[PDB]
Write an enzyme that holds these catalytic residues in place. Structure first.
Site: not given
Ligand SMILES: Nc1ncnc2c1ncn2[C@@H]1O[C@H](COP(=O)(O)OP(=O)(O)O)[C@@H](O)[C@H]1O
Ligand SMILES: [Mg+2]
Ligand SMILES: Nc1ncnc2c1ncn2[C@@H]1O[C@H](COP(=O)(O)OP(=O)(O)O)[C@@H](O)[C@H]1O
Ligand SMILES: Nc1ncnc2c1ncn2[C@@H]1O[C@H](COP(=O)(O)OP(=O)(O)O)[C@@H](O)[C@H]1O
Ligand SMILES: [Mg+2]
Ligand SMILES: [Mg+2]
Ligand SMILES: [Mg+2]
Lengths: 76, 75, 77, 75, 364, 46, 536, 130, 52
Positions: G56, G89-90, G393
């Protein structure tokens, strides 16, 4: 402005300067001190001075001559 | 315009109020601008001119200081 | 004989030494003139003019002044 | 009338050397009125000077009544 | 920094100033009548102008957060066990006195709450109390059982603001607590700012007396601070317009006009004062130069064009950052009250005059 | 803060005893430090 | 030091702008490696050996020690995004840092910061409008599968990622269980009312979703029963202890014969209160305060469970779910002291369950309201903590999806579409804001680039293919189905993310854009720094 | 020197309310009647506050810096002694004046009331000023 | 901040002239509330002319 009282400093460390009033004050003070010291040895009833050296030899000198008195004094 | 201006104005007004209150208490007034100083110095000089000895020299020095005050005013 | 540390002060000292070497007189007028020129340049810079423009204007004004000095000069025996 | 003129002159002379010399006339009238409002009392603490920042020095005035710097109740 | 939001804040500031004064009579504006509340979260686009009263205190009650047709009551005494100003103790010598004391205290609290409820009150504001519990737990339970919202720990300094806003007369003794002394309102509810805190807003009052509240929101604390400072500046400008009903052009026009006219005046003051007045005019010529320099323009050409155009006869000519040159500034709607410029001149001149009288520095 | 030019008097003469009392120890310390520094830093650095 | 004579350092011009951009880039690069399903978690040692394993962004930026105030601005930006949305958040930090970097690059070309700020504001507004008008998918046309897909997308890149097929169902059921309606008929989901309990032991698969409530508490005395088949829950907000008079009451004995009776009453009062409570048939007594030994013995003899030192929020949730009423005191409106049966909650079972050498209370199948709780099992405490963060989350994501019925395709599809649309849009807005809007559009491309870089794949070619697909979608009226094309990080090829079930709440993207734009504007407005030296 | 923690870490025992704003401190001392708090600072002024309303009733300046404050319990208005200067000073807050002074850190008021200790770094009778 | 009064107050200027400029900014804020930067700029320019 002046060199001493300026936002930026133009001098080496340990070097300073004295402006009009300060320079005149210091010059007059030094001259008056020298005159007062050398006097009281003037005229038939003048007295003498003891010149005690601060060196290792510590030469002792009793004199009335003004020139010899003024020679053997650390003057700044 | 500034706090320093306000403080100086308060001090000056206090001076004026105190002098006015003193004048109300005692209404005798003398002229300024060095007139009183020069008059006192003239009286002292007149006294000194009739005084023998070094006391005359001391009186003359006193009058010299009295005259020096308005001299500083003019400087 | 001054124990200066600022580089611009050293430049002023070198200017005075140069005036002494070439002419031998007027070693004090050069410093005052340079100080006045730099003060006016400070005012101009505060008004927002490029320093190179100020230097060029000073150069051409100095050329005009030198020409005028040549014009108003007098010869002696 | 002569005493009032003397008070005017004395206040002006006192304020001449201070920063109030810019508005000497206004401040002299101010101080003379303030002192004369005391009805002969010597209580200089009966005269309150309130310093409020902002505004010009010529904006200073003597309130025709009195000013307090406290608060009124709620209802 | 709040320039893209000016379309939202400027009408908001004008409404805030107008709502707290009488335009036909008022000669000054008391900015303490405009309360500014800063809440983190959201965006400056979410800034709101609340007509009623906004309280940051939380509701002590649970389950009651929205009351319609509220009757707010302001209380300045404590709803707890009786306690005289004199030192007091209860002496127990028999076992019956124990539960008699407990029952009597319960009856006293119940009577207090019943007297409060009989007036028709449904929202209770309790002033912050020290040396005595303002709101007892048993009192809170009784108030909850009769469906009354309770808000406690109200600051002493906010009593005047609350009374001005919702028209409630404060109550210090239960004897004088009556219905006619309450303050009616249309709605009193507690809202949540999308998981960034809770605000109690009492919107809609029978007697909305010369008071308004401003809510400021932003992403971080620094931008919120700058936004509230800018809002205060706008309110101060409208206050200046209220005090002195005079308007002047902006964009450096007054300074250029002043420099030109003061140069002309100094040309008729032969002596050593002419040089000083000319220097004064040249110093006044600085603000347009700074505006041109910050705008990215050439200060020399821009300033001389301003001076020439003002000499032509047009005095509403100033810096046009949007156009990038010099034009009539009223078409850009860049105006400021005359009081700002007049006060700036007077205060700066007085400060300079005071400075010029100083000739020595003494270190205490 | 004036009158710097003094040329002093027999006052320092009246305190020659303590002056030399401290100066002998100071000179001994200086000699010891000079004999120590003839090697230290003079050879330790390089 | 100069003519200012201020006791502190001063930086002006390009120096302070470069320093601010450096701080923002440092904060971005800290968390850039933990974005996307091919992202990796991080360790955080707390100088005393404490270990925090997390992915996170908000937790990482909160635990870090930051000194530069621009880095702070970014950290509180991430914290605000976490508080107000709960996901992305990231992404918001990365987007804000890229926006600031490109804005500084524009400013270095003598583009005035006001023009850049105006262009950024216009681009943000138009991006929000375009997202709301062309990139939203209504959830009513997808059904329950949309919620599961959104939860799975949220769970990717987390320690519960691959096992997301099992966790998504649990999260969806937990969220749907705590649903309740309020005034004006607008259903709301009080997420964080789903109590989450961490207890190591069995694998992740053994995580239990309680159809009720779970207390991290045990019974006060070992003599009480540890299971009730028909719970009559009574919730109290006061302690059950020996009665003691208040500070204003003193006991003065002049006749010695009354001391024994007074001492007897001191406990008889509590005995009478407990008997009044028990006489109504209550089986479970939960109190926020303490309970003395004899009061516990009363429940022991009555054969009723009693739990002490219950948390206030847990008690509130239990009372709401079971239909009980919190009683801070026993006092009716008649001045007496009574306890009615109407103030009793009801549950189908209350059990003292044992979970990995520790015991906890399960209140199963509460009536008059459905509640939920989740017990997470992991290898150790760090793994369970990361599970809890990821679960929170996912719960927030499902809450946003259920509240606002619009979702957007994931995997950088929105970023590429917005970049293409905004770079086409900049040409028809002003002359100086054109560059600002173009740089905004180009900065939006940092998300798919980071995803591809984390995948250790060809970021350039993948982003080029995405941009080509989205350009074809935007310029060809009959190829509008390409808007959903995102990134397939497993195979490194473009993929229809709407058909692949990669969804995100629209509010996440919208709030990320707004907050990042505001943070970039705030940092960009600075051109000089004065750092006063500390007075200590 | 003795500053109690902030949250009071208790369960609403009707004593968690403490004010303790500390707007002035070296000699904070609660009075006989708890409605008033008396505090002193290094500016040479003694400040009296009403704890309930929460504003400075009236400040006392007759000294350098003041260090030690002791109060004679009588309505909290009768007298209070300050020994911060080497000048033991007694003030009456029904008039706001220094009623008596003694030109001579740990001053202690005697329980009798006719005298008071003036421990520094003597039993001064108030009936004889010696 | 962009406010002149806030900028001058937050940074601790030490020279007396700067302190009086800060007080001037405060007074301008009190009387008007705007033009706090302009008044300081005007005072600085006036004293700069006073130099020559
Ligand atoms: N199965 C998937 N295939 C392609 N892209 C994905 C998949 N799951 C998540 N993503 C992308 O990865 C990106 C990173 O999300 P993440 O970093 O986990 O959220 P946060 O920023 O809250 O930590 C998201 O913008 C999402 O669109
Ligand atoms: Mg996320
Ligand atoms: N207008 C004036 N013309 C001539 N002399 C004046 C004038 N005003 C004041 N003085 C003289 O200046 C002297 C000093 O007065 P001032 O500086 O005002 O107060 P202080 O006596 O405290 O120095 C007085 O002796 C007075 O005679
Ligand atoms: N849109 C504009 N075009 C030209 N000049 C402007 C514009 N807005 C403000 N100004 C000028 O900028 C100057 C500075 O105003 P501002 O920075 O808002 O407050 P302060 O006067 O306190 O610095 C004002 O004198 C005003 O004339
Ligand atoms: Mg010569
Ligand atoms: Mg005088
Ligand atoms: Mg302004």
């Amino acid at each position: 402005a002046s060199l001493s009282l300026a936002p930026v400093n133009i001098f080496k460390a340990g070097a300073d300067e004295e402006r009009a009033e300060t320079a005149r004050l210091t010059s007059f003070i030094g001259a008056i001190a020298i005159g007062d010291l050398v006097k009281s040895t003037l005229g038939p009833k003048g007295m003498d001075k003891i010149l005690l050296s601060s060196g290792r030899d510590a030469s002792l000198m009793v004199t009335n001559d003004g020139a010899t008195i003024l020679k053997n004094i650390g003057v700044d | 315009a500034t706090q320093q201006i306000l403080d100086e104005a308060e001090r000056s007004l206090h001076d004026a109020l105190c002098v006015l209150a003193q004048t109300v208490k005692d209404s005798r007034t003398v002229y300024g601008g060095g007139c009183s100083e020069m008059l006192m110095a003239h009286a002292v000089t007149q006294l000194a001119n009739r005084t023998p000895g070094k006391e005359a020299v001391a009186m003359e020095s006193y009058a010299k200081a009295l005259r020096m005050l308005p001299t500083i005013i003019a400087d | 004989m001054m124990d200066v540390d600022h580089q611009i002060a050293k430049l002023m000292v070198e200017l005075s030494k140069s005036q002494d070497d070439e002419i031998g007189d007027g070693t004090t007028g050069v410093v005052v003139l340079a100080g006045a020129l730099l003060e006016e340049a400070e005012q101009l810079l505060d008004r927002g003019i490029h320093p190179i423009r100020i230097a060029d204007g000073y150069e051409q004004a100095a050329r005009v002044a030198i020409e005028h000095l040549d014009k108003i000069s007098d010869s002696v025996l | 009338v002569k005493f009032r003129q003397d008070l005017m002159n004395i206040a002006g002379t006192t304020l001449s050397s201070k920063l109030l010399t810019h508005h000497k006339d206004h401040f002299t009238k101010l101080a003379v009125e303030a002192v004369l409002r005391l009805k002969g009392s010597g209580n200089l603490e009966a005269i309150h000077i309130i310093k409020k920042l902002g505004g010009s020095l010529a904006d200073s005035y003597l309130d025709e009544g009195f000013l307090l710097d406290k608060k009124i109740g709620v209802n | 920094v709040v320039s893209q939001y000016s379309s939202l804040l400027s009408p908001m500031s004008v409404n805030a100033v107008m709502k707290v004064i009488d335009p036909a009579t008022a000669t000054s504006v008391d900015l303490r009548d405009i309360k500014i509340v800063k809440k983190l979260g959201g965006t400056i686009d979410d800034c709101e102008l609340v007509e009623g009263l906004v309280l940051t205190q939380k509701v002590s009650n649970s389950g009651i957060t929205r009351v319609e047709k509220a009757k707010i009551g302001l209380i300045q005494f404590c709803l707890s066990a009786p306690k005289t100003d004199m030192d007091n103790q209860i002496v127990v010598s028999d076992y019956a006195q124990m539960d008699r004391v407990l029952r009597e205290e319960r009856a006293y609290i119940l009577n207090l709450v019943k007297q409060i409820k009989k007036t028709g009150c449904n929202v209770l504001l309790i002033q912050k109390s020290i040396l005595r519990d303002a709101l007892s737990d048993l009192a809170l339970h009784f108030l909850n059982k009769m469906k009354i919202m309770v808000i406690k720990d109200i600051e002493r300094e906010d009593i005047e603001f609350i009374c001005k806003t919702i028209g409630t007369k404060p109550v210090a003794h239960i004897d004088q607590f009556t219905a006619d002394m309450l303050g009616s309102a249309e709605l009193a509810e507690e809202v949540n700012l999308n998981g960034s805190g809770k605000l109690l807003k009492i919107t809609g009052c029978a007697s909305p007396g010369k008071t308004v509240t401003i809510v400021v929101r932003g992403s971080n604390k620094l931008v919120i601070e700058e936004a509230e400072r800018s809002i205060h500046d706008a309110l101060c400008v409208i206050r200046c317009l209220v005090k002195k009903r005079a308007l002047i052009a902006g964009g450096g026009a007054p300074e250029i006009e002043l420099a030109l006219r003061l140069t002309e005046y100094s040309r008729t003051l032969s002596g050593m004062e002419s040089y000083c007045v000319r220097a004064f005019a040249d110093a006044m010529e600085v603000i347009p130069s700074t505006l041109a320099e910050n705008a990215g323009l050439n200060p020399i050409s821009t300033v001389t064009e301003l001076r020439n155009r003002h000499a032509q006869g047009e005095k509403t000519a100033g810096i046009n950052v949007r156009k990038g040159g010099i034009s009539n500034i009223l078409e850009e709607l860049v105006v400021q009250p005359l009081l700002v410029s007049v006060s700036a001149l007077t205060l700066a001149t007085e400060t300079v005059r005071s400075i010029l009288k100083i000739d020595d520095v003494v270190n205490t | 803060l004036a009158g710097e030019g003094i040329s002093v008097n027999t006052g320092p003469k009246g305190v020659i005893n303590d002056w030399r009392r401290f100066k002998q120890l100071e000179t001994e310390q200086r000699e010891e430090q000079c004999r120590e520094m003839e090697r230290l830093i003079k050879k330790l650095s390089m | 030091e100069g003519p200012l004579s201020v006791f502190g350092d001063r930086s002006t011009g390009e120096t302070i702008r470069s320093q601010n951009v450096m701080a923002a880039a440092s904060i971005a690069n800290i968390v850039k490696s933990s974005l996307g399903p091919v992202g990796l978690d991080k360790m955080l040692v707390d100088d005393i050996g404490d270990v925090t394993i997390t992915n996170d962004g908000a937790t990482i930026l909160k635990l870090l020690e930051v000194e530069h105030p621009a880095a702070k601005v970014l950290c509180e930006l991430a914290d605000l995004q976490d508080k107000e949305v709960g996901d992305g958040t990231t992404s918001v930090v990365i987007i804000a840092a890229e926006l600031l970097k490109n804005a500084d690059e524009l400013v270095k070309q003598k583009i005035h910061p006001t023009s850049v700020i105006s262009g950024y504001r216009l681009a943000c507004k138009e991006a929000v409008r375009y997202i709301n008008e062309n990139l939203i998918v209504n959830t009513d046309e997808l059904g329950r599968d949309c919620l599961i897909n959104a939860a799975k997308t949220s769970m990717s890149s987390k320690i519960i990622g691959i096992n997301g097929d099992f966790f998504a169902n649990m999260v969806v059921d937990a969220v749907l269980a705590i649903k309740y309606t309020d005034i004006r008929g607008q259903p709301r989901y009080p997420v964080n009312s789903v109590n989450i309990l961490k207890a190591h032991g069995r694998s992740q698969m053994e995580s239990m979703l309680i159809s009720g409530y779970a207390l991290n508490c045990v019974v006060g005395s070992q003599g009480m029963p540890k299971r009730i088949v028909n719970a009559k829950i009574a919730c109290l907000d006061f302690s059950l202890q020996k009665t003691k008079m208040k500070l204003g009451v003193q006991v003065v004995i002049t006749d010695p014969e009354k001391l024994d009776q007074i001492r007897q009453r001191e406990s008889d009062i509590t005995k009478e209160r407990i008997q009044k409570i028990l006489a109504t048939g209550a089986n479970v007594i939960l109190t926020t305060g303490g309970i003395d030994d004899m009061c516990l013995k009363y429940f022991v003899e009555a054969g009723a469970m009693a739990v002490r030192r219950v948390l206030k929020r847990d008690l509130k949730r239990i009372a709401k779910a079971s239909g009980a009423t919190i009683l801070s005191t026993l006092a009716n409106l008649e001045g007496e002291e009574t306890f009615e049966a109407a103030m009793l909650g009801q549950a189908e079972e209350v059990v003292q369950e044992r979970i990995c050498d520790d015991e906890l209370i399960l209140i199963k199948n509460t009536k008059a309201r459905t509640s939920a709780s989740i017990i997470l099992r992991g290898a150790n405490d760090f793994m369970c903590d990361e599970m809890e963060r990821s679960l929170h989350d996912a719960l927030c994501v499902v809450k946003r999806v259920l509240e606002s019925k619009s979702v957007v395709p994931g995997g950088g599809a929105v970023e590429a579409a917005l970049s293409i649309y905004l770079e086409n849009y900049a040409t028809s807005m002003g002359s100086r804001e054109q560059l600002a809007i173009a740089e905004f559009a180009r900065s939006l491309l940092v998300i798919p680039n980071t995803l591809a870089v984390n995948a250790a794949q060809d970021s350039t070619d993948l982003v080029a293919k995405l941009r080509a697909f989205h350009n074809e979608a935007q310029v060809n009226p009959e190829r509008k189905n390409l808007k959903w094309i995102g990134l397939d990080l497993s195979n490194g090829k473009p993929r229809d993310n709407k058909q692949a079930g990669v969804f995100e709440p629209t509010i996440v993207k919208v709030k990320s854009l707004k907050f990042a734009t505001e943070a970039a504007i705030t940092i960009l407005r600075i051109d000089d720094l004065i750092k006063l030296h500390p007075e200590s | 020197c003795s500053v109690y923690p902030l949250t009071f870490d208790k369960n609403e025992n009707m004593a968690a309310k403490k004010k303790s704003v500390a707007m002035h401190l070296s000699a904070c001392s609660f009075t006989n009647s708890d409605m008033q708090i008396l505090t002193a600072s290094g500016d040479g002024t003694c400040a009296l506050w009403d704890v309930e309303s929460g504003q400075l009733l009236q400040s006392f300046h007759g000294h350098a810096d003041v260090l030690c404050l002791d109060l004679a319990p009588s309505e909290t208005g009768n007298t209070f002694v300050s020994g911060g200067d080497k000048k033991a000073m007694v003030w009456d807050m029904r008039s706001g004046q220094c009623v008596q002074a003694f030109e001579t850190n740990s001053v202690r008021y005697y329980p009798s009331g006719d005298a008071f200790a003036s421990g520094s770094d003597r039993l001064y009778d108030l009936r004889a000023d010696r | 901040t962009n406010d002149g009064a806030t900028i001058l107050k937050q940074m601790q200027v030490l020279h007396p002239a700067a302190r009086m400029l800060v007080e001037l900014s405060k007074a301008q804020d009190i009387e008007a509330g705007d033009g706090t930067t302009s008044v300081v700029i005007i005072a600085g320019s006036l004293l700069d002319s006073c130099t020559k």
